Amino acid sequence: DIVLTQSPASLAVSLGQRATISCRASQSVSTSYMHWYQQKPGQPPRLLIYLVSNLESGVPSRFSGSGSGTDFTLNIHPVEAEDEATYYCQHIRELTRSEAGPSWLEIKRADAAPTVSIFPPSSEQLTSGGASVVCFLNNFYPKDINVKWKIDGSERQNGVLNSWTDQDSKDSTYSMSSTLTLTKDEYERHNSYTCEATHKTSTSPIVKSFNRNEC
Amino acid sequence: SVSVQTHGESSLVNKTETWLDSTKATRYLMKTENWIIRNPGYAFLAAVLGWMLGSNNGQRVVFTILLLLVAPAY
Amino acid sequence: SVSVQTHGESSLVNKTETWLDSTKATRYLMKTENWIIRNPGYAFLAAVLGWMLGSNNGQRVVFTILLLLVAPAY
Amino acid sequence: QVQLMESGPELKKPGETVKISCTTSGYTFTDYAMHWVKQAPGKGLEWMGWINTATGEPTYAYDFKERFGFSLETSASTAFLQISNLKIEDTATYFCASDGRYWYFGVWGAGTSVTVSSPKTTPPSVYPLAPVCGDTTGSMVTLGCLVKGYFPEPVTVTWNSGSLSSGVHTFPAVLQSDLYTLSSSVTVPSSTWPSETVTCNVAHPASSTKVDKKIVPR
Amino acid sequence: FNCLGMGNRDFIEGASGATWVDLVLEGDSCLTIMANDKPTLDVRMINIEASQLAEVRSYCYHASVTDISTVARCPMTGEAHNEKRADSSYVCKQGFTDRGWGNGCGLFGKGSIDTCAKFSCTSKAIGRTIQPENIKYEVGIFVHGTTTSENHGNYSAQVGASQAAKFTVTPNAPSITLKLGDYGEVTLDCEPRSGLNTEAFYVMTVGSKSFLVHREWFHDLALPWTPPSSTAWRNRELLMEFEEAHATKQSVVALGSQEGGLHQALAGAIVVEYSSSVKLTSGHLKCRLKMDKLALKGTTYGMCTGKFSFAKNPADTGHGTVVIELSYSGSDGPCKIPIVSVASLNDMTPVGRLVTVNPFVATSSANSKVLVEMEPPFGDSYIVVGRGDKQINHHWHKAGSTLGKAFLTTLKGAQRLAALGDTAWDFGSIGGVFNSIGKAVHQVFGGAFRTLFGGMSWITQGLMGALLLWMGVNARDRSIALAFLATGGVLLFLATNVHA
Amino acid sequence: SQLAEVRSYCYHASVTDISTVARCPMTGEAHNEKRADSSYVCKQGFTDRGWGNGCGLFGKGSIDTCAKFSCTSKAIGRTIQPENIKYEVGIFVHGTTTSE
């Protein structure tokens, strides 16, 4: 009966700056009965705030928040690299118990342009009958990015496999790998292969191109 | 407090539908009946006190029916 | 309703400061005293009924002091 | 210490049944209910329900009813999540919790990732990827390794037995005909290739295939 | 966990004769056991814990009116039906609108209307039901050894000395055996299920806080309530009202938040907090203390050969005993601390008894603080620490002489009889015969009589008792006490017990 | 027409800034600095003391518990002036009329 949503869904902020999450609960006067969960992708979360005023055991004192009824908040003044995770929340009073559309912490840094490398399919894959043209976009920030596979100057959205990581542990940037899969006969009937990468850093798409007739 | 000592009843002019009218009949009885059902063991010995004293018959019930109404909410 | 039929008293274990304790002594008396001050003219003829019947002296007050407590909030 | 362990990653097919186990420690089992929470493939956490443990009573969230179940074993402190008529949309990670009632819980379960798909266990296609002239930018030659069509997860993709992790980015894999395709790119300076050996080592113990492919110049 | 500085500290006089004893304890009160060969013990409840609580139902105290809809009809049409009666979310009620030829109808004097308003709950309370096995009890137990002002009020410090212990008794494991180390082991057999009555009441949550309410009164609450699962409620028309009907206009108005009325409905309710596990303040539990393996070591010691000092100045515990803390500057330790409680200085015969038996120096380190408590006799006494000319003494006087103390046992004994029900005779420990039949006579007297008319509130049973005292005035020979039976005691007592 | 404001009533309140200044037994009254402002609701009291908590004496204590008062909701009354009272009195005479 109650709808929950957490905002901003993605927040890029440097460590040490306060992050106050604007939130709400649809079914009103929950009393407090609101929580906070931090979850890195591929892990279970961890309860941050209960009673809305109080931490669990393991969670350090940097986590806080306040609210009642509809609106609630998660206020972390000293955000940290250890705080990087997907923030979740969940409600009580009525049933069934449900969560909100989550919010990501992102540690802020300088906007980085991707390193784009487009590799022709191996001679081993051609002999296998297929051809997968891969395009690696490394160390770009922020996560907003786009890949476009231009074959002989024409964009093809078929066979496009986009594998990108999350925010890195070391440099805290994003890395993306795009893959254009074709058959060898379809690979040998098309000449120019390029993946243009547009990003908030570069006002123009980064164009890395190769032709089968070229080398 | 606000729970007791209600405005009811105005009893000045007032031919109309008041704030609470039909629920005014459920004020005492039902809450006192929920009390005597709460405490049935009292109700057994309650009416006994009426037949104890005075030997005047019909007014012995005047004790009970009045006294059984005293105990709820004092 | 929530106004009457209070939880009080638990009376199970409970040596502590409850939700309302010191105000429990002001529940009935003060509200019934505010009623008899509200209706003094009744209180004059109220205690008269005790001296009317039974001629048994001291138990005639048992009528009054009990009956004067009946009229407030029925 | 209170730590909730579950059955690990499970490989399933549509139409089968599964019982997902949650083993609890550090407390008496019947004393805490088990909150079950599903994590949707879109990384939404969808709450499945809580089982009254005493008394062994499951309480479903209405969307999860009648094809799912909550069962228990008291002595060894193992809570069970039973699922009937498996569906591909149920591929997800599942969780259990130690009940603190109306404030939820203080401890999260280890998690169970169920995979409902209809593939054959397959070794990956591991392709050394030769960079072209346009692939060499800023004194560095980027090299890459295509890992194509492997089931099941995971695969360990290293470079020269993991000796050079410098520019190595191992990217996730998604579903193609219930097979997984990922690519890994090592970033080394142009003086190191093809002067120094660079070989992507793809270890897929699920298919028992450790593949070594060195990129050669064109 | 210990009896140090607790609000209510009661003692236990060992008669020996048995190594087992059946005692009842409480969260606020701390029992203190003193026996031969057995050191001084502290037994108290930390709090009452409960693990799993089922959801019985909920109550919506605060509501709001949404989407007022009234379908007007002509007189003689009988019932009026609004299409909103299909959904249970809409609150519908019959009614009428007096009609002329001016408004909507061609007839006079009567009408029919169906007034529907969608129900919206702004705020709702939630209740809880307690399972017997889920109830836990954290019982602090402590034995008095060498202590300071720090370690004695400290738990983990006395755990290193094994002089304090905590544990959780449940119906699944009512018996727990814990070792005190150098002083031996004690066995505690409790009755977790029967300490309280698990099904006698519920736990009601009003707002953020939760509170205790009787479960028979819980269902008797008059206010819109809620089934466990989700949707359809009952008596939700009580928080809303109606008005006169002018043409199609009738205004359904909602009552305000009843949270205050719920707090008004709470009087004798105990404030209870919670985090993972609910912690109840006032405890009731029946435990069995087995001292068989608890004993006294160090029978071969001797007295300390050197000067003493006061680490803190003496004072009165208010419970009838006097505690002191001593910093022993002598290096001859470990040694048994010489000390006594005497009438006069010229009389070396000890009179007052040591609360903490066998004072002992922990280590040879000089200036080591030691906190030892003693019970002096009534009247002028002296606290003498040490023997020979290096003793340092203190004068004490206690006005609590057994005359008043006999009533402190008597009056509080009847107070121990009240509010503890039939378990009140568990202070008759190592009982039988008298103590057994004393509870047995009160058993059925507790299962009848006072519990039959029970539920009386304050002056209700108190005022009629004064009228029942008049029943003792009018009577006959051999019939005197018959009308006087329940009057004196068990009735006016508890009325005098709680004033206020 | 015109209604003067007699007074108001706060039915709904909330507790803010709970402050309790603890003191030793035999010290008599306890005084918290919040008794200066009328916004803070202060009350006397005591805390039974041992040697374990805060004091070197037993059985008694003194504390001053202050909490800032915050009114969530309040009712308001109004007093009626005699001249301000108006009466709209419909008067009608029956001539030729219709249902309209």
F12, F50, F99 ranked by CB distance to E5: nearest: F50
Helix (H) or strand (E) holding E194: helix E192-195
Q: Which two tokens stand for residue E180?
A: 């005190």
Dihedral Cα E478, E484, E488, E492, nearest 10 deg: 180
Report yes or no: A192 and A150 within 8 Å, Cβ to Cβ.
Answer: yes
Bridge partners (DSSP) listed for residue A57: none
Angstrom distances, CA of residue D194 to CA of A215, C60, D188, D191, D218: 16, 120, 10, 8, 10
CB of E4 closer than 8 Å to CB of E153: yes
Q: Where are the alpha helices (DSSP H) in E230-292?
A: 259-265
Instruction: Evaluate the CA torsion angle E429, E433, E434, E440 in order and state its sign.
Output: positive
Asked if the Cβ–Cβ distance from E262 to C2 is below 8 Å, we say yes
Of D53, D62, D106, the CB nearest to E276: D106
Distance from CA of D38 to the nearest CA of E (A): 20
Check CB contact under 8 Å for E5 and F57.
Answer: no
What one-character-per-residue DSSP string does chain D give?
---EEE---EEE-TT--EEEEEEE-SS-GGGS-EEEEEE-TTS-EEEEEEEETTTTEEEE-GGGTTTEEEEEETTTTEEEEEE-S--GGG-EEEE-EEE-GGG-EEEEB--EEEEE-----B--EEEEE---GGGEETTEEEEEEEEEEEBSS--EEEETTTT--TT-EE---EEETTEEEEEEEEEEEGGGTTTS--EEEEEETTTTEEEEEE----
Burial readout D189-209 (b: 16 or more C-beta within 10 A, e: otherwise): eeebbeeeebbbbbbbebbee
Instruction: Please state, in angstroms and rounded to a whole number, the distance separating the CA atoms of residues C70 and E464.
Output: 13
CB-CB under 8 Å, E275 with A54: yes
F10 to each of E62, F34, F75, F76, how far by Cα in Å?
18, 22, 6, 8
Q: Six-digit token pair at F34?
A: 């919040």
Closest partner residue to D54 among E126, E134, E274, by Cβ? E134
Q: What residue type is assigned to position E472 of the chain? A: G
Token pair of E163, please? Answer: 């002089």
- Do the chains contact at E451 and B41, CB–CB below 8 Å? yes
- How far is Cα E422 from Cα E412, in angstroms, rounded to an integer? 16
Q: Do F48 and E4 touch (CB under 8 A)?
A: no
As for chain E, the residues directly before each break of C–N over 2.5 Å are none
Prior bond of D119 cis (ω within 30°): no
- Nearest in space to D127 (alpha carbons), one of D107, D108, D147: D147
Do E and A make contact via 3 or more CB pairs under 8 A? The reply is: yes
**Of D64, D1, D2, whose CA–CA distance to D32 is shortest?**
D2
Q: How far is CA E318 from CA E143, E312, F25, in A?
A: 21, 17, 12
B5 touches chain C (CB under 8 A): yes
Please give the backbone phi and psi of residue B59, each rounded to the nearest 5 degrees, phi first.
Answer: -80, -10
C2, C17, C25 member nearest E499 (Cβ): C25
For tokens 């629920």, name the residue: B23
Q: Confirm or reject contact between A1 and chain E (CB < 8 A).
A: yes
Residue C28 has φ and ψ, to the nearest 5°, of -90, -60
Q: Does B8 touch chain C (CB under 8 A)?
A: no
Whether the CB-CB separation of E271 and C19 falls below 8 Å is answered with yes
Angstrom resolution of this structure: 4.7
Between chains, do E276 and D100 touch, taking CB under 8 Å as contact? yes
> Given CB atoms, is B22 within the 8 Å cutoff of chain E?
no
CB atoms within 10 A of CB F53: 14
The answer to whether F52 contacts E152, with C-beta atoms less than 8 Å apart, is yes
Q: Do A95 and E123 touch (CB under 8 A)?
A: no
User: Helices marked H in E208-352 — which ranges?
Assistant: 215-219, 259-265
Whether E413 has its CB under 8 Å from any CB of chain F: the answer is no
DSSP state of E181: G
Write b or e for each residue in E417-446: b if 16 or more Cβ atoms lie within 10 A of its Cβ, otherwise e: bbbbbebbbbbebeeeeeeeeebeebeeeb
User: Beta partners for A5?
Assistant: A24, A101
Q: What is the dihedral of CA D186, D192, D196, D198, to 10 degrees?
A: 10
Q: How far does chain B reach from its first CA to its final CA, in angstroms?
A: 16
Partner E contacted by B45 (CB < 8 A): yes
Which residues have C-beta within 8 Å of that of residue A61, sequence separation ≥ 6? A55
- Of E303, E281, E295, E282, nearest in space to E41 by CA: E295
Interatomic CA distance for residues A57 and A51, integer angstroms: 13
Distance from C-alpha of A17 to C-alpha of A19, rounded to nearest angstrom: 7
Token match 């008004």: residue? E264
A31 → closest Cβ in E58, E208, E275: E208
Q: Give the E-state strand segments of A42-113 in sequence order.
A: 49-50, 54-55, 75-76, 86-88, 100-101, 103-107
Q: Which residues contact A158 (CB under 8 A, 6 or more apart)?
A: none
Say if CB F64 and CB F21 are below 8 A apart.
yes
Q: Which of B8, D35, C10, D218 is nearest to A121 (CA)?
A: D218
Other beta carbons less than 10 A from residue E227's beta carbon: 13
HSE-CB at E317 with a 13 A cutoff on CA atoms is 22
Q: Do E286 and E15 form a contact (C-beta atoms < 8 A)? A: no
Token representation of residue D65: 């009813």
Check CB contact of E156 with chain D, cutoff 8 Å: no
Chain F positions touching E325 (Cβ under 8 A) are 51
DSSP H helices, B1-74, are: 29-38, 40-46, 48-52, 59-70
E476 touches chain C (CB under 8 A): no
> Which amino acid type is present at position F31?
H
Q: What are the chain F neighbours of E102 within 8 Å (beta carbons)?
A: 99
Domains of chain A: 6-108 (2.60.40.10), 109-212 (2.60.40.10)
Mutate to test the interface with B, among C7, C26, C74 (most CBs of B within 10 A): C74
Q: Quick check: D52 contacting A, CB < 8 Å?
A: no
Which residues 432-471 of E have a C-beta within 8 angstroms of B? 451-460, 463-464, 471
Number of C-beta neighbours around residue F86 at 10 A: 6
**Closest CA of chain E from B22, distance in Å:** 11
Q: Give kind and range of the element (H or E) at residue C34.
A: helix C29-38
**Interface contact E268-C66, CB threshold 8 A:** no
Least CB-CB distance to B34: which of C3, C5, C73?
Answer: C5
- Touching subunits for chain F (3+ Cβ pairs under 8 A): E
From chain B, pick out residues whose CB is under 8 angstroms from the CB of C35: 5
C-alpha dist (Å) from residue E98 to B22, E109, E245: 19, 5, 8
Please name the residue that has the structure tokens 């603890």: F22
Q: Is residue A19 within 8 Å of residue A79, measured between CB atoms?
A: yes
* Cα-Cα-Cα-Cα dihedral sign, residues C15, C19, C22, C27: negative
C11 to chain E: closest CA residue: E419
Contacts of C40 (CB under 8 A, 6+ apart): none
Contacts of E274 in chain D (CB under 8 A): 103
Rounded CA separation E454/B32 (Å): 15
Packing angle between helix C59-70 and helix B59-70, nearest 10 degrees?
Answer: 50
Token match 């009629």: residue? E464
Amino acid at E261: G
Residue E330 is which amino acid? G
CA distance A11 to chain D (A): 17
- C9 — phi, psi (to 5°)? -115, 150
The pair of structure tokens assigned to A106 is 């992102």
* Contact yes or no for C70 and B73 at CB 8 A: no
E228 to chain A: which residues are within 8 Å by CB? 95
DSSP state of F25: T
Task: Provide the chain E residues 217-256 that lie in CB contact (below 8 A) with chain C.
Answer: 217, 220-223
d(CA E176, CA D26): 18
The torsion angles phi and psi of E12, rounded to 5 degrees, stand at -135, 125
Residue A85 near residue A94 (C-beta atoms within 8 A) = no
Q: Do chains E and D touch (3 or more CB pairs under 8 A)?
A: yes
Interface of D with E (CB under 8 A): 27-28, 30-33, 52-55, 62, 99-103, 105-106
E102 near F CB under 8 A: yes
Residue E288 CA, distance from chain mean position: 20
**E211 Cβ contact list (under 8 Å, min separation 6):** C19, E203, E204, E205, E266, E269, E270, E271, E272
| Residue E277 with chain D: CB contacts under 8 Å | 100
